[PDB]
Amino acid sequence: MFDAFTKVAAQADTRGEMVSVAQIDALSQMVAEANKRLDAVNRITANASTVVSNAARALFAEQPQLIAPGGNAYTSNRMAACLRDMEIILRYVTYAVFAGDASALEDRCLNGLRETYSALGTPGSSVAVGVGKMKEAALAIVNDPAGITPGDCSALASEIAGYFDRAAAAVS
């Protein structure tokens, strides 16, 4: 896996160069907003189970054929596994945010997922909707002005949105 720094250091090394005054600057900036990023991570994390559960509930209401007997989330075995996935996807998206790089998510989580689902008979488009619901609630939770130093978090939010978006994209 790369982190935001390490990603750049990897690209530099295959060129044989030292990072450019330009690109140290870009990173130096990313360092200044460190604090926001961490709040993002703490806020999503400190709400993991509300984020997941609420999202799963809203998915099943929306799509009852999933929990109807014979649908892919019928049976405790499966219900649990489906919750478990939601949570994982969320866990991995937080890592991505913490590290400022999509790799910890692409590599250890999204990659090959599409074919796992396809082979099991899990409907991906459904997982996506679930992931999408988590995205929304996560975002709301980070952007809430209550209890924190006021500032612009809009860039961060756009980034976080990205990570969710590719999790979803990776299962359609």
């Binding site: 896996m1 982190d3 390490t6 530099a12 030292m18 140290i24 130096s28 994390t45 890592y95 913490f98």
Partner: protein
């Protein structure tokens, strides 16, 4: 790839748990340090040529045989002198990378791992490179935190060579 951020994420994932405050305290530590770290990298980058030249010479001075012994592992010709700079270059570059990444990671992965064999195979002396590094230390002229940290990576390469 040993960096505060990846190490942190990596334990967490190995214990299948969400990032707790612990890992946040790690990211804090890293982000706080990065200020010193990145100015450090810049400085080294701009003194790049003086540093390399300077270091190469230093080794040639401590080990004069290396400039007149015949044959390929030594630097009596131009071809050799060029390899030697090249390598000292590598060390320096890795050191910059370390400062940027906040750990030994990139030096570990790009240079330290497998160094043993290369040196043994091509008959290159660890002692030569140790001197190169010693010089860089006494000549980067860095101040305070930048210095303490850069030196930590230079001493690390030195340790990896004894």
């Amino acid at each position: 790839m040993k960096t505060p951020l990846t190490d942190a994420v990596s334990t967490a994932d190995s214990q299948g748990r969400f990032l707790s405050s612990t890992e946040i305290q790690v990211a804090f530590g890293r982000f706080r340090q990065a200020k010193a770290g990145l100015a450090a990298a810049n400085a080294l980058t701009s003194a790049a040529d003086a540093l390399i030249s300077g270091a190469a010479q230093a080794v040639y001075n401590s080990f004069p045989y290396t400039t007149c012994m015949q044959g390929p592992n030594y630097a009596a010709d131009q071809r050799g002198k060029d390899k030697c700079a090249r390598d000292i270059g590598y060390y320096l570059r890795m050191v910059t990378y370390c400062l940027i990444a906040g750990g030994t990671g990139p030096m570990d992965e790009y240079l330290i791992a497998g160094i043993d064999e290369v040196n043994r195979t091509f008959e290159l002396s660890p002692s030569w490179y140790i001197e190169a590094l010693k010089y860089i230390k006494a000549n980067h002229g860095l101040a305070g935190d930048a210095a303490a940290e850069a030196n930590s990576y230079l001493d690390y390469a030195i340790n990896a060579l004894s």
